[PDB]
């Protein structure tokens, strides 16, 4: 019961980390296109 | 102590596999001991991990011999044995998880579903269909094929031909493991052959030559010819001769359901054609089917969707269009929508691997 | 008691999601970086080709460049003097005048109507007897 | 130098809506104060994504074709995918030998 | 570029210490040094460039219409591109091009569909 | 089979048929539920009817039916309603799962209901049926007498009254059991509950419950008063200490409170001591003099300092950029910190004659790092060099005041006033860069001395330096208002500061007011939310950079998901090069308590595009993983160390060193290479100025305070926060326009020490101590599981790892009164025979009285 609280913190941190990776990849697809235009 | 309890469980499983037909003398004589090892909550006692060292196929073989009124020999006439077993398997499902432990989960739903198909109703079936759907990466190739085999049979009864057609084709793919080159393959094959006939027709038996015995092949040829010629008299006779097969499968209903397709197929073969169509020419064609009901059968045809045509019975001539020209009917649009699903769904699983 | 078990599943699930995304993330990330390096390279005046006339033992070399006149330039420290030799064709930076690689040696009678023909196809049976 | 300093259908439709809406408001005002052809081509012409309807017949045929082209591309992505699965499959295999 | 000459009593008082630049300033007294290039502009400029770069919105409608006109040719060349593409993959057995080659074709269809 | 027979009878439509079909239905619902589902309308209708007689049985069946579908909440409604036929002291697997679901439901209503009114709990006002189960679940676990399971649940369902009662009834003084349970619940409430309003309530109560027992655990009692940071809690505690009066215990407690607590807190604590008249001893402790002096005494004897390393380092580089001169003035201060020896600087004077203005100010300010730890010899040393006395430049006189402000932070009471007189004086003079450098130190010092209380007098003085608009001095004043008002600012102060950033047209003053704004919200949490928006709502780069530090500081300690989401979000979605680096730096402060998690969050980001990002992750780990020696932190920092981009090498080198301070060859095989690497980089010419700055200062970290200190953002001696240290590292982490500002690392050195302190001789024994950690897997650097018997001595280098297995010898001439406790920090003895010394030494407060 106490345990779950510990584990919920690890789960939450991880969840945000995953959503943040998704978002970063988006800026990169964008970056790619822009870089091809510049070259 | 711990190691000894895991060992204890391996020894009961092992014993239970041995005392069957597989690795020992005759399954029925042995059944009572096989049942003693299951029953007094030693199966329960196994919960160190999930059931996947004993499998649904195995629980199936012991329970069928116990009870089916043909191996039991009307030993008892009650499904008292199965009711306790189904309940206990149901009791397992509650504490089963779906996300990472669905090895035990699919197997239990397989055993329960099976019993409904053996003897039950097509009404209660709906809930079991919805519960079943769980990843197909967790269960063996052998176990996946059996899961599809039962699902496909259930879908046929509802008259979902298409869904069963996909599951069956996937079911019988490759053979890295047995019961996709054995007796199980032949059972699958018969059910696949039936599902294609239901859709319209099966006109290929190339694969089936090599994966089925001669006794099966003859009835497959007789059916496909009856349905292709359109001739009801040959079809009926095919059921009559291979009465023993249709009974065996436990599905004499198929005969009743398919026969309607044959008379529908006959009316179709000679299309709509010319802009006015003579009564006589069509009468001749309908006479084959049933000859004292020319006007009724043609009326039934139009409502049904066998044909679409426009009738005068104060002139007694038939008017038609003949369409062989395929303009757009949302047909690009449909392609696109399908493709976005096809690419994403495929794409994600391939990526995980 | 049911509740603790459910939290343990959702973690296990999440990690696989991290593993998949991470692997793709890297592929894109590399591509931007690759393109940047390529862009630094695509800014250049080129390297001049020259012929090493002779090497001086004080770390000059005498080069006749084909682009220009004749020049004294500073031997590179990316190559050693025993790679260089008389009549070597080299690539030397127009930027830094450092001999960065060696091509091949050249000649002039070999293209003034004298020529090599390795392993000839004539036999004694050809004009036999 | 400009570029060094600095380093869809809907937006146009919303503008369109606002002009029409403004135009109506003006026409009401204009009658009140007072007590052709351009407006007349701006109503009947568009009555029939609206215009694009009449065109849809021709669009559709080419629309199958360009769809088939995207489908070949999906297959192509699957093909590339299979190589990735093998690469992972190889690594695992070498780790087991070792 | 921007360069200025060095001044004494400033660029030694500001930026062992700098032995080099210290002998340089007691020496020459003036010598070139490079000054950084930056920009500063207001928000008002920044907003009202990006509605020029009305022409862009109205120009965007016009462009969509005339694109559908030219699509007859643009169709045919992607058909060709694909034939090369498939042939290429055969010879290898390149892959990279094909993927880039696949992505591009997807982008173009998204555009073709949007037009109409 | 079929339930179709049973259901046929239900439709007949009388009382008997309802009851028979019900009692049949209960048994095999679960398997036949499918068939029964269609008659679930009749069952619910019977539910809230009573034309029949079956209601509570009907609700029961319905629960079972709903259950089998997968509608758990739906089943839960009816399970409750079944009333008398449903019991939670009877368990099946079915029962377990809907009690579980009933708690979840209860949790949901309780989250919402606490936010709404914070005495929801003092009455039933929620669903009675749920409440009934809830009390009874609590009783069950507790009758079985495991108290961690019951307390876990009571937390979760956000009601305080259950927590109080539950614990209370089972406090039976055993004593061992009461203490241990209460210590578990305290740790829990802090780490896992960031519902700040709820968490405080549990803390204040758990404090009075432990306090009321005749036996207490005084270490745990100090934790909670530091956390809630109240003088009022302090006063109740001390009057309890009056009843059981012992000079050893009361003294220990003051040695704890002085370090951890804030300046203002300390101040009301002297006032209350003065007015309670209880112990004049303790009031001197509360002035901080004893603890710092004891450390001095330790550092002078256990120093291992080498000027040959600084000599080697300087000759390894070549001068051509004043960045190198800073590097060695600074590595020297750090290395020789607390040992009161200026030795290097004393030895080499011609290079000093070369040095630019800033480099002079830094040389002068290095004395301050060394002479920290003296609050009476601190002032004395700097007297020949002040304004009005000797020096050789006014930049040298300016650094004298910067160095005084370094030392006398944490007890700046005199020095703030003293410095203020210099501020008001030199506001006229700005005609020469000689005065701008003087007034620049002046502003640093005053901000540093007045930290942790908030004197508006200092704020108003530094602000007129902005109106006079002097280019160097305005940077120090701006940052200085932020330091002074830290965590105790006016709302007005925020608004005035915020407007002035916008007004100022000098780059440096704008930079200093950005960082200035972040500091002033320290520890606010949600209360800072208004300012976060405002900094990001300014479309200035400096202000958006400044916004990121404001979350790190406000949400520090125990981490908060909302806070990490916002910072990661700016890091990903903002493309501005300052902004991305600051938002990654910022994660490390949030995450100091939960430091394990920082290599995973920053895993990705370390291999991610743009060097500023990669720089930011080095810092994140450096701040967060400092002192622990996390094996995962080091593995991430290795690639970055030989990265092409020079300031990336630099920051990773600084970072590695902070984690691995006072960790040795053999303990870690890897450090030998690392030290090699630091050395090789200075010596090669192929590195650039920024990379060697990173390298020089990195040696300087490892070798800091004569090898005896670690860098931590809390105490070990209470195990609760230490403000100074946190603040120090955020100024430390930036250097980009902040070329002299390295010096803020003096405040982050904590000594790694276990020494005994005689209660009435105030002296250090030198005696042999026992240990079970393997010595000679500890060594003298430069110039694993254990239980094996071993030895260590007193006044020798106690490492983090070592501290855990050491034990005071009990049986020479002293009693160690509360004993050692398995963490760093002193323990006060009270002597059996003070009057013969065992092998004592004289401390430095007895060399200067």
Contact C16 B351 (CB under 8 A): no
| Residue F196: alpha-carbon gap to chain centroid | 16
* CB contact set of F786 (below 8 Å; sequence gap of 6+): F772, F773, F774, F805
Minimal CA–CA distance to F661: which of F718, F721, F702?
Answer: F702
CB F358 within 8 A of CB F327: no
Six-digit token string for F20: 């028979």
Helix (H) or strand (E) holding E4: strand E3-5
Q: Which of D7, D69, D87 would you mutate first to test chain E, the one with the most E CBs within 10 A? A: D69
For F654-717, the DSSP string reads: HHHHHHSTT--TTT-TTHHHHHHHHHHHHH-SSS-HHHHHHHHHHHHHHTGGGGTEEE-SB-SS
Six-digit token string for F506: 């000098």
* 3-state secondary structure string across D18-85: HHHHHHHHHHHHHHHHHCCHHHHHHHCCCCCCHHHHHHHHHHHHHHHHHHHHHHHHHHHHHHHHHHHH
The experimental method behind these coordinates is cryo-EM
Residue with tokens 């902040």: F738
CB F232 within 8 A of CB F204: no
How, if at all, do strands F756-757 and F827-831 pair?
parallel
* Distance from C-alpha of C27 to C-alpha of B79, rounded to nearest angstrom: 60
* Distance from C-alpha of C19 to C-alpha of F607, rounded to nearest angstrom: 15
Contact with chain E for residue F692, Cβ under 8 A: no
Reduced to 3 states, what is the DSSP secondary structure of residue F263? helix
* Distance from C-alpha of B286 to C-alpha of F653, rounded to nearest angstrom: 94
Beta-carbon contacts below 8 Å between C and F: 18
Reduced to 3 states, what is the DSSP secondary structure of residue B15? helix
Contact E109 D55 (CB under 8 A): no
Which residue on chain E is closest to D65 by alpha carbon? E75
Contact with chain E for residue D52, Cβ under 8 A: yes
Minimal CA–CA distance to B88: which of B117, B127, B59?
Answer: B59
CB F506 within 8 A of CB F543: no
Q: In this complex, which of B100, B351, B352 lies closest to C9 when CB atoms are compared?
A: B100
Minimal CA–CA distance to F389: which of F381, F397, F378?
Answer: F397
Helix (H) or strand (E) holding F841: none
CB B195 within 8 A of CB B156: yes
Residue F802 CB neighbour total at 10 angstroms: 23
Minimal CA–CA distance to B98: which of F70, F99, F108?
Answer: F70
Longest dimension (CA), chain E: 75
Six-digit token string for F80: 């409750």
For F130-143, the DSSP string reads: HHHHHHHHHHHHHH
* Distance from C-alpha of F276 to C-alpha of F270, rounded to nearest angstrom: 10
* Ramachandran class of F357: left when φ > 0, alpha when ψ lies in -120 to 50, beta otherwise: alpha
Minimal CA–CA distance to F837: which of F773, F739, F767, F786?
Answer: F767
Count of residues for chain B? 353
* CB contact set of F234 (below 8 Å; sequence gap of 6+): F225, F257, F265, F269, F272
User: What are phi and psi for residue B151, nearest 5 degrees?
Assistant: -65, -40
Residue with tokens 């009874």: F136
Six-digit token string for F198: 């709820």
In what side-by-side order are the strands of the sheet with B318-319?
A: B276-277, B318-319, B310-311
CB B54 within 8 A of CB B13: yes
In what side-by-side order are the strands of the sheet with F814-816?
A: F756-757, F827-831, F814-816
Q: Which of F141, F565, F584, F606 would you mutate first to test chain A, the one with the most A CBs within 10 A? A: F565
Count of residues for chain E? 116
Contact with chain B for residue C8, Cβ under 8 A: no
User: What are phi and psi for residue F345, nearest 5 degrees?
Assistant: -65, -40
Contact with chain F for residue B95, Cβ under 8 A: yes
* Distance from C-alpha of F684 to C-alpha of F217, rounded to nearest angstrom: 56
CB F58 within 8 A of CB F27: no
* CB contact set of D63 (below 8 Å; sequence gap of 6+): B332, B333, E113, E116
* 3-state secondary structure string across F434-488: HHHHHHHHHHHHHHHHCCCCCCHHHHHHHHHHHHCCCCCHHHHHHHHHHHHCCCC
Residues from chain C that touch B99, judged by Cβ atoms under 8 A, are: 9-10, 12-13
CB F778 within 8 A of CB F802: yes
Q: Sort F83 into a burial class: Cβ within 10 Å, 0-12 / 13-18 / 19+.
A: middle
CB F79 within 8 A of CB F63: yes
Contact with chain A for residue F181, Cβ under 8 A: no
Residues from chain B that touch F97, judged by Cβ atoms under 8 A, are: 94
Question: Chains with ≥3 Cβ pairs under 8 A against A?
Answer: C, F
* CB contact set of B287 (below 8 Å; sequence gap of 6+): B294
* Distance from C-alpha of F97 to C-alpha of F94, rounded to nearest angstrom: 6
* Distance from C-alpha of E17 to C-alpha of F354, rounded to nearest angstrom: 7
Contact C3 F104 (CB under 8 A): yes
* Distance from C-alpha of F343 to C-alpha of F333, rounded to nearest angstrom: 10
Six-digit token string for C20: 């998949």
Contact with chain A for residue F26, Cβ under 8 A: no
Six-digit token string for B142: 């052998």
Count of residues for chain A? 39
* Ramachandran class of F525: left when φ > 0, alpha when ψ lies in -120 to 50, beta otherwise: left
Contact with chain F for residue B77, Cβ under 8 A: no
Six-digit token string for E88: 């290429």
Q: Provide the total of helices (H) and of strands (E) in chain A, helices listed first.
A: 1, 0
Contact F97 C2 (CB under 8 A): yes
Residue with tokens 């009559």: B240
Count of residues for chain D? 98
Contact D70 B351 (CB under 8 A): no
Q: Sort F202 into a burial class: Cβ within 10 Å, 0-12 / 13-18 / 19+.
A: buried
Which residues are registered as beta bridge partners of E5? Answer: E32
Residues from chain A that touch F564, judged by Cβ atoms under 8 A, are: 13, 16
Contact with chain C for residue A27, Cβ under 8 A: no
Reduced to 3 states, what is the DSSP secondary structure of residue F801? coil
DSSP symbol at F384:
G
Which residue on chain A is closest to C23 by alpha carbon? A21
The radius of gyration of chain E's CA atoms, rounded to the nearest angstrom, is 29
Contact B351 C9 (CB under 8 A): no
Contact C2 F609 (CB under 8 A): no
* Distance from C-alpha of F503 to C-alpha of F496, rounded to nearest angstrom: 11
Residues from chain F that touch A12, judged by Cβ atoms under 8 A, are: 561
Reduced to 3 states, what is the DSSP secondary structure of residue F216? coil
Six-digit token string for F96: 């377990």
**Resolution of the experimental model in angstroms, please?**
9.5
Which of D 15-34 lie inside 8 A of E, CB atoms? 15
Looking from the CA of B25 toward its CB, the CA atoms found within 13 Å total 3
Minimal CA–CA distance to F813: which of F754, F773, F756?
Answer: F756
* Distance from C-alpha of B231 to C-alpha of B240, rounded to nearest angstrom: 15
DSSP symbol at C125:
T
> Pseudo-torsion of CA F233, F235, F238, F243, nearest 10°?
-110
For F781-794, the DSSP string reads: ---------EEEES
Contact C25 F609 (CB under 8 A): no
Q: In this complex, which of A2, A27, A28 lies closest to F148 when CB atoms are compared?
A: A2
Residues from chain F that touch E21, judged by Cβ atoms under 8 A, are: 320-321
Residues from chain F that touch B128, judged by Cβ atoms under 8 A, are: 34
- Provide the terminal-to-terminal Cα distance of chain E, rounded to the nearest Å: 50
* Distance from C-alpha of F542 to C-alpha of F536, rounded to nearest angstrom: 10
* Distance from C-alpha of F524 to C-alpha of F162, rounded to nearest angstrom: 29
Q: What angle do CA F418, F423, F428 make, to 5 degrees?
A: 145
User: Is it the case that chain D and chain E have 3 or more CB pairs lying under 8 Å apart?
Assistant: yes
Q: Which of B94, B98, B99, B134 would you mutate first to test chain C, the one with the most C CBs within 10 A? A: B99
| Residue B304: alpha-carbon gap to chain centroid | 26
Residue F22 CB neighbour total at 10 angstroms: 22
The radius of gyration of chain A's CA atoms, rounded to the nearest angstrom, is 17
Q: List gaps in chain E by the residue before each (C–N > 2.5 Å).
A: 15, 53, 93
For B89-154, the DSSP string reads: HHHHHHH--SSS-HHHHHHHHHHHHHHHHHSS-SSTHHHHHHHH---SSSS-HHHHHHHHHHHHHH
* Distance from C-alpha of B68 to C-alpha of D50, rounded to nearest angstrom: 66
Q: In this complex, which of C9, C10, C20 lies closest to B352 when CB atoms are compared?
A: C20
* Distance from C-alpha of A35 to C-alpha of A30, rounded to nearest angstrom: 9
User: Is it the case that chain E and chain C have 3 or more CB pairs lying under 8 Å apart?
Assistant: no
Minimal CA–CA distance to C78: which of C90, C88, C94?
Answer: C90
Question: Chains with ≥3 Cβ pairs under 8 A against D?
Answer: B, E
Alpha helices in E11-54 (DSSP H): 19-25, 43-49
CB F571 within 8 A of CB F613: yes
* CB contact set of F632 (below 8 Å; sequence gap of 6+): F596, F599
Q: In this complex, which of D74, D78, D88 lies closest to B353 when CB atoms are compared?
A: D88
Reduced to 3 states, what is the DSSP secondary structure of residue C105? strand
User: Is it the case that chain F and chain B have 3 or more CB pairs lying under 8 Å apart?
Assistant: yes
F526-531: Cβ within 8 A, 24+ apart: F526/F196, F527/F554, F528/F554, F531/F494, F531/F498
Looking from the CA of F301 toward its CB, the CA atoms found within 13 Å total 19
* 3-state secondary structure string across F571-614: HHHCCCHHHHHHHHHCHHHHCCCCHHHHHHHCCCHHHCCCHHHH
Minimal CA–CA distance to F547: which of B12, F309, F539?
Answer: F539
* Distance from C-alpha of F703 to C-alpha of F782, rounded to nearest angstrom: 9
Can you state the percent helix, strand and coil of chain F, rounding each to 5?
65, 5, 35
Contact C29 F96 (CB under 8 A): no
Which residues are registered as beta bridge partners of C92? Answer: C48, C99
Contact B350 D74 (CB under 8 A): no
Looking from the CA of B109 toward its CB, the CA atoms found within 13 Å total 27
Residue with tokens 């190691």: B3
Which residue on chain B is closest to D78 by alpha carbon? B347
User: What are phi and psi for residue B318, nearest 5 degrees?
Assistant: -110, 135
Minimal CA–CA distance to B179: which of B220, B205, B144?
Answer: B144
Reduced to 3 states, what is the DSSP secondary structure of residue B75? coil
* Distance from C-alpha of F142 to C-alpha of F134, rounded to nearest angstrom: 13
The radius of gyration of chain D's CA atoms, rounded to the nearest angstrom, is 29
Q: Sort F416 into a burial class: Cβ within 10 Å, 0-12 / 13-18 / 19+.
A: buried
């Amino acid at each position: 019961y106490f345990k779950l609280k510990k584990l919920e913190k690890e789960y939450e941190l991880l969840t945000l980390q995953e959503d943040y990776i998704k978002d970063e990849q988006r800026h990169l697809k964008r970056e790619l296109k822009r870089a091809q235009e510049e070259v | 102590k711990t190691i000894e309890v895991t060992a204890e469980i391996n020894c009961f499983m092992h014993l239970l596999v041995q005392l069957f037909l597989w690795d020992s003398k005759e399954l029925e004589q042995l059944v009572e001991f096989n049942r003693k090892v299951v029953i007094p909550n030693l199966l329960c006692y196994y919960n160190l991990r999930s059931l996947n060292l004993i499998n649904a196929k195995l629980w199936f073989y012991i329970y069928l011999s116990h009870e089916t009124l043909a191996r039991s020999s009307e030993e008892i006439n009650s499904d008292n044995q199965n009711i306790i077993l189904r309940s206990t398997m149901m009791k397992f499902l509650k504490i089963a998880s779906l996300k990472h432990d669905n090895e035990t989960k699919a197997m239990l739903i397989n055993l329960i579903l099976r019993d409904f198909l053996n003897n039950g109703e097509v009404d209660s079936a709906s809930d079991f269909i919805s519960k079943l759907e769980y990843p197909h990466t967790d269960v063996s190739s052998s176990l996946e094929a059996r899961y599809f085999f039962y699902l496909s049979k259930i879908n046929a009864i509802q008259l979902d031909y298409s869904t069963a057609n996909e599951y069956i084709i996937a079911a019988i793919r490759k053979a890295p493991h047995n019961s996709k080159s054995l007796g199980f393959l032949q059972q699958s094959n018969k059910l696949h052959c039936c599902i294609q006939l239901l859709m319209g027709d099966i006109p290929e038996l190339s694969f089936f030559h090599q994966s089925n015995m001669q006794k099966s092949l003859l009835p497959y040829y007789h059916l496909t010819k009856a349905v292709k010629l359109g001739d009801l008299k040959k079809f009926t006779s095919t059921i009559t001769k291979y009465k023993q097969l249709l009974l065996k499968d436990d599905t004499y209903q198929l005969c009743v359901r398919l026969r309607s397709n044959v008379i529908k197929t006959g009316i179709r073969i000679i299309s709509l054609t010319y802009k006015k169509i003579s009564l006589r020419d069509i009468c001749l064609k309908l006479n084959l089917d049933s000859e004292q009901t020319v006007e009724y059968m043609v009326s039934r045809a139009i409502r049904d969707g066998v044909i679409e045509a426009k009738i005068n019975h104060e002139d007694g001539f038939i008017e038609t269009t003949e369409l062989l020209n395929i303009y757009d009917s949302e047909d690009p649009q449909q392609v696109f929508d399908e493709r976005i699903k096809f690419a994403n769904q495929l794409h994600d699983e391939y990526l995980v691997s | 008691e049911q509740k603790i078990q459910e939290t343990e599943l959702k973690i296990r699930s999440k990690t696989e999601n991290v593993r998949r995304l991470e692997a793709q993330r890297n592929a894109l990330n590399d591509k931007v970086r690759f393109i940047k390096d390529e862009l630094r390279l695509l800014q250049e005046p080129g390297s001049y080709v020259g012929e090493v006339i002779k090497i001086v033992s004080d770390k000059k070399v005498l080069v006749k460049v084909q682009p220009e006149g004749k020049y004294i330039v500073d031997v590179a420290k990316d190559i050693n003097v025993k790679d260089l030799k008389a009549s070597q064709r080299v690539c030397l930076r127009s930027d830094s005048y450092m001999l960065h690689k060696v091509l091949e040696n050249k000649a002039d009678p070999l293209v003034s109507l004298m020529m090599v023909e390795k392993v000839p196809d004539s036999t004694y049976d050809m004009v036999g007897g | 130098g400009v570029e060094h300093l600095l380093r869809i259908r809907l937006t146009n439709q919303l503008k369109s809506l606002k002009g029409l809406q403004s135009k109506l408001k003006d026409v009401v005002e204009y009658l009140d104060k007072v007590i052709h052809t351009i407006l007349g081509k701006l109503q009947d012409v568009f009555n029939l994504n609206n215009l694009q309807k009449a065109l849809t017949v021709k669009t559709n045929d080419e629309l199958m074709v360009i769809y088939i082209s995207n489908l070949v591309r999906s297959i192509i992505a699957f093909d590339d995918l299979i190589e990735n699965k093998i690469q992972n499959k190889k690594i695992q295999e070498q780790r087991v030998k070792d | 570029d921007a360069f200025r000459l060095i001044d004494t009593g400033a660029l030694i008082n500001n930026l062992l210490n700098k032995a080099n630049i210290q002998a340089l300033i007691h020496g020459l007294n003036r010598h070139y040094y490079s000054l950084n290039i930056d920009y500063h502009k207001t928000a008002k400029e920044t907003k009202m460039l990006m509605n020029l770069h009305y022409e862009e919105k109205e120009e965007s409608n016009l462009a969509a219409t005339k694109s559908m006109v030219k699509i007859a040719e643009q169709y045919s060349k992607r058909i060709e591109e694909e034939k090369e593409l498939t042939e290429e993959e055969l010879k290898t057995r390149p892959k990279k091009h094909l993927s880039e080659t696949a992505d591009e074709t997807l982008e173009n269809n998204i555009v073709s569909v949007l037009t109409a | 089979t079929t339930a179709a027979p049973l259901l046929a009878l239900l439709r007949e439509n009388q009382d008997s048929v309802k009851t028979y079909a019900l009692e049949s239905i209960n048994n095999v619902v679960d398997q036949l539920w499918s068939e029964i589902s269609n008659e679930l309308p009749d069952i619910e209708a019977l539910y809230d009817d009573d034309t029949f007689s079956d209601r509570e049985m009907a609700a029961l069946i319905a629960s079972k039916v709903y259950y089998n579908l997968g509608e758990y909440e739906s089943a839960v409604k009816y399970a409750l309603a079944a009333k008398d036929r449903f019991d939670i002291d009877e368990k099946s697997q079915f029962v377990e799962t809907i009690v579980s679901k009933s708690i979840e439901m209860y949790v949901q209503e309780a989250s919402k209901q606490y936010t709404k009114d914070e005495q929801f709990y003092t009455k039933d006002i929620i669903d009675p049926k749920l409440t009934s189960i809830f009390e009874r679940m609590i009783e069950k676990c507790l009758k079985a007498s495991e108290l961690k399971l019951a307390l876990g649940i009571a937390l979760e369902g956000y009601r305080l009254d259950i927590i109080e009662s539950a614990l209370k009834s089972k406090l039976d003084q055993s004593t061992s059991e009461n203490v241990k349970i209460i210590n578990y619940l305290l740790t829990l409430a802090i780490t896992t509950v960031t519902n700040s309003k709820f968490r405080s309530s549990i803390l204040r109560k758990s404090f009075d419950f432990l306090m009321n027992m005749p036996n207490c655990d005084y270490l745990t009692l100090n934790k909670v008063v530091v956390n809630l940071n109240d003088a009022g809690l302090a006063l109740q505690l001390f009057k309890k200490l009056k009843e059981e009066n012992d000079e050893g215990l009361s003294a220990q407690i003051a040695f704890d409170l002085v370090s951890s607590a804030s300046q203002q807190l300390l101040e009301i604590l002297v006032t209350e001591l003065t007015a309670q008249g209880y112990d004049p001893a303790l009031l001197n402790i509360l002035s901080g003099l004893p603890t710092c002096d004891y450390y001095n005494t330790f550092l002078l004897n256990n120093k291992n300092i080498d000027i040959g390393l600084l000599n080697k380092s300087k000759s390894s580089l070549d001068g051509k950029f004043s960045l190198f001169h800073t590097a060695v003035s600074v590595a020297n201060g750090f290395m020789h910190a607390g040992t009161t020896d200026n030795s290097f600087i004393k030895a080499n004077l011609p290079w000093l004659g070369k040095a630019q203005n800033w480099a002079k100010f830094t040389a002068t300010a290095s004395l301050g790092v060394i002479h920290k730890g003296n609050l009476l010899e601190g002032k004395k040393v700097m007297a020949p060099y002040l304004p009005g006395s000797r020096a050789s430049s006014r930049f040298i006189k300016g650094g004298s005041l910067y160095g005084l402000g370094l030392i006398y932070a944490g007890f700046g009471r005199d020095t703030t006033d003293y410095l203020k007189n210099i501020i008001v004086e030199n506001s006229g003079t700005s005609g020469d860069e000689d005065v701008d450098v003087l007034l620049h130190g002046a502003s640093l010092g005053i901000g540093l001395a007045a930290m942790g209380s908030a004197n508006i007098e200092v704020y108003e003085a530094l602000k007129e330096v902005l109106y006079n608009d002097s280019a160097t001095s305005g940077e120090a004043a701006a940052l200085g208002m932020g330091l002074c008002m830290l965590g105790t600012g006016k709302p007005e102060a925020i608004h005035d500061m915020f407007t002035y950033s916008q007004e100022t047209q000098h780059g440096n003053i704008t930079r200093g007011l950005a960082v200035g704004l972040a500091l002033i919200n320290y520890g606010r949490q949600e209360l800072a939310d208004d300012l976060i928006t405002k900094m990001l709502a300014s479309d200035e780069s400096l202000l958006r950079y400044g916004g990121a530090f404001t979350i790190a500081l406000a949400y520090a300690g125990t981490g908060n998901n909302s806070a990490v989401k916002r910072l990661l979000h700016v890091a990903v979605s903002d493309s501005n090069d300052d902004v991305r680096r600051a938002a990654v730096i910022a994660l490390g402060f949030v995450l100091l308590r939960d430091y394990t998690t920082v290599p995973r969050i920053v895993q990705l980001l370390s291999k991610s595009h743009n060097a500023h990002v990669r720089c930011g992750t080095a810092f994140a780990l450096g701040i967060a993983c400092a002192g622990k020696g996390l094996q995962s932190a080091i593995d991430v920092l290795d690639p970055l160390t030989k990265d092409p981009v020079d300031f990336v090498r630099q920051a990773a080198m600084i970072a590695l060193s902070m984690i691995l301070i006072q960790q040795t060859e053999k303990l870690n095989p890897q450090v030998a290479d690392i030290n090699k690497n630091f050395l090789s980089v200075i010596t090669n010419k192929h590195q650039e100025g920024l990379a060697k700055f990173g390298a020089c200062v990195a040696q300087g970290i490892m070798n800091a305070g004569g090898r005896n200190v670690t860098i931590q953002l809390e105490n070990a001696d209470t195990g609760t926060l230490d403000t100074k240290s946190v603040v120090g590292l955020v100024m430390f982490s930036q250097f980009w326009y902040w070329f002299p500002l390295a010096h803020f690392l003096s405040l982050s050195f904590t000594p790694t020490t276990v020494i005994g302190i005689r209660g009435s001789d105030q002296a250090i024994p030198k005696f042999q101590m026992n240990c079970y950690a393997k010595e000679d897997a500890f060594s003298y650097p430069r110039m694993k599981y254990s239980s094996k018997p071993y030895k260590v001595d007193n006044m020798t280098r106690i490492l983090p790892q070592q501290s855990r297995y050491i034990s005071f010898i009990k049986d020479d001439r002293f009693v160690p009164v509360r004993k050692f406790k398995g963490n760093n920090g002193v323990v006060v003895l009270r002597d059996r025979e003070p009057k013969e010394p065992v092998a004592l030494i004289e401390t430095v407060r007895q060399m200067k009285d």
